[PDB]
Design a protein around this ligand. Sequence first.
Ligand SMILES: Nc1ncnc2c1ncn2[C@@H]1O[C@H](COP(=O)(O)OP(=O)(O)NP(=O)(O)O)[C@@H](O)[C@H]1O
Ligand SMILES: [Mg+2]
Lengths: 39, 576, 372
Amino acid sequence: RELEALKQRFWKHAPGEKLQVLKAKLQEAMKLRRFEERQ
Amino acid sequence: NLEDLKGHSVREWVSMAGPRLEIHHRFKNFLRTHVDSHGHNVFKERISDMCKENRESLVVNYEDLAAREHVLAYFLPEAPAELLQIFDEAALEVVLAMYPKYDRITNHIHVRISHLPLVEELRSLRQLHLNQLIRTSGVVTSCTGVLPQLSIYQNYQRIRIQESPGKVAAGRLPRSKDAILLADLVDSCKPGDEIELTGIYHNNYDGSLNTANGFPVFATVILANHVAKKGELTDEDVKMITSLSKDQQIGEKIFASIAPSIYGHEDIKRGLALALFGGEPKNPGGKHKVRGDINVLLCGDPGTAKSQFLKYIEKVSSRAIFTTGQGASAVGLTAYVQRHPVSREWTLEAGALVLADRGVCLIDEFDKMNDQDRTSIHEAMEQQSISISKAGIVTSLQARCTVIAAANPIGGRYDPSLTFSENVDLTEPIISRFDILCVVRDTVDPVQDEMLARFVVGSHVRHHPSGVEPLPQEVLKKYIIYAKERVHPKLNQMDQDKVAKMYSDLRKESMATGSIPITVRHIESMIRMAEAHARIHLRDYVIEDDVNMAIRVMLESFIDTQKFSVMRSMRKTFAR
Amino acid sequence: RIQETQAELPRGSIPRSLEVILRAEAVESAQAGDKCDFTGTLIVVPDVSKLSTPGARAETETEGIRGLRALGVRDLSYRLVFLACCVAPTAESIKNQMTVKEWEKVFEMSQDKNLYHNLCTSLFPTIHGNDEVKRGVLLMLFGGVPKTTGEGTSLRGDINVCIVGDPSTAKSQFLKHVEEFSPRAVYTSGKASSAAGLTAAVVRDEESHEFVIEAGALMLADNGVCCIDEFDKMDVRDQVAIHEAMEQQTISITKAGVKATLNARTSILAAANPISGHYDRSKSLKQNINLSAPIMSRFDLFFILVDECNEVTDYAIARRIVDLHSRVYSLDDIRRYLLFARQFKPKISKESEDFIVEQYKHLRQRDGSGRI
Ligand SMILES: Nc1ncnc2c1ncn2[C@@H]1O[C@H](COP(=O)(O)OP(=O)(O)NP(=O)(O)O)[C@@H](O)[C@H]1O
Ligand SMILES: [Mg+2]
């Protein structure tokens, strides 16, 4: 019990990847808008 | 649907007629329909400003392009040389639709992207990034002349940028890259600048590298698309700025907004404000130039926030430099001569006072310079130039800056039993070149201690990572840049008899105590302070209120120079 | 470029060196000064400047080979290179590294009773007496939370500690002991062993007769702890530079060809000698030591160490020394626990403000009654 509580309060106090994250977000927006336009 | 990537690379896909036309229409419709949060059209205003000034260059923001037409924002970094071409073609006909005669001025318009999110460090570039749009930062070290390049002819310039000093690890060495500037980007920078560069990463063959390494290894370069340092005010900005000037208490709002976390010290904030806005330079009859800038000096006991104020001034102002005592040399302050690395001839280069130019030059531990280094600034502080004659070179350079300095009293603590000159140890040719002089002292009132301590403790709990009301700091920054560029105070008349009588009386008393000697410079200084107060109120003409303010500041700072026992009599003498 | 390590160089010989080539995922994994083991193959590379092809021409006491069409009437020579396919040294990270044993150990430490004294004993087992010094130096390792004010100025995090004492006694032991314990720490002295000393310096590089910087001790000790011995005797050039480095945690240079701002974010532990060697027990610290008031006012804590020849104490010290030569928590437990503790960022409570402001007011009025 108490060890996990200690971990929890401890965590409470505590190339190319950027383009991939950007692509994921924009592609989600693309999918949503083309779905709405299609209906 | 444009998104249907099948059987083709994106470079091939946007080459196809159908996709090219869809991209063209989408960007054009985005230009005409884009609205701000207020319901205002953004690009109507921006295009009209571009046309009125004949500037032939259109800036777009990546964030709201993505927010409204994400499919284009998705393709843009993957095939920049294609989408940027289509964008240029689309923008020119919107411009001609609004302004049908604009083809008389130019036949092409360039679209420039900004606030691109995927920033990269200047040593983390790899072959993974070739032929894509990137963003980096660094300081310029080499910069060719502007030369014409075949296409018709257009301007061309080449630069070299390296990692910003102090962002490399201690004791190791920096990386660097070359970049190319074309058309309206030339002379957007000069050596020693720190810049933010957006461009295309590009590579080509070079026999020298293959023969030097023995492996088939290529050379690379960056094609610049947008360059910005790390006015363009909207109608709403100038509207709010001008409306704020109506307030009769605007002086309290501006003064109370300088170094906000420092408690107390009203006089220091007031003096720094006047020095931040500044008086106006002039040359009556063409043969008799005089400077506009207002210099400041601070002196007093340790632990009183003197070093902190300079750091705030460095942050709020633009074109600022900071330096300390033994860390600077006469040659580094003014200008230096060297055997040029590749031209193999003697050449002259700018030091601190030249590199600052129309900016602020901050000095700390001013008491502890070598005297032979401190006497280098005498010309720059008054004649506002730097004259050099060395190694066959004979020339002069501009030094149009404001100097602010901080010092310590002799023996570490100020004594009110002695005058300023007795306590500071600086000679008259130095002391007389500062417009505002301040003295800061320890005090021992228990209620003041309790208030100061409670405020500091409050500040600590406030900033954990988690008088009148002051302005937000961005509003103040907008206000200063507007006031310095759009208002120029005129001194059409003032009472000569009043100032002359006061000056003669003041100078006579200065002879008696000898705390500071008073000279012709003091009159000209009051004229500068009067113009500065006029500029804070955004007024084109100086008035009676401004002259009274200038006299108050002058005399209040003068009384502090005297011995404690003398100050009462002096204060009653100069009743105002 | 690599060189023979100190262990291999045969006596009297000049060192040999080799060119190593790294590719793909291995790139920029080794820095100058590192010592590593490389795995790969030895290869032979031709002089590419004398070969000719349809795509590109040839550029142009030994002779090469002759008689290839691509070589014309020139001659070709080779050199040796080593192509390396692999190279190795010769918040979430804590969760990845700590097993259940380490988690249990830091939990037991968190629940421990009189943990402060237990850690003092564990970290400084050799030391005798002087508990106040042990508590003070132990606290320095935990630092203090830095804060950035909204207008962009910042507030200092590290504390600084000073120890003055007689050359015969304990002050040197603390410095060398904490340096042996701690990660990423530097030992030096006011009589420094380099042209840079305690803060950065400018040197002219003969490859171009161009001016460049060279790092001092406080630059290398950035994000670490710095131990300075014989601090009472120091160069004036560094002494002026220390005024800025102590509080602003930065160093500023403006000389011919060089203009820069450099970081010096460090916790300093200084050791000094009083005038005449032995501390005058009848006089204040400020009368005893050589330091000036501006430098002296920077430190958060001060301590004094001075000997006297008590027979039992001398006999006990001697027996401790000879017994040590005759032969709770381990240092790795302290390291793991310290790295765990430094992730917390505690706030002050509202009620604590009243006690803090009261104590400061009491101190200030005491000072005013007989500076702070
Ligand atoms: N009135 C104040 N309000 C807030 N912080 C203060 C105040 N007075 C002193 N400090 C703090 O005291 C520290 C030292 O500030 P500093 O600007 O170096 O004072 P100083 O008088 O210039 N010291 P020195 O350079 O040795 O003369 C900083 O952390 C300041 O924020
Ligand atoms: Mg200071």
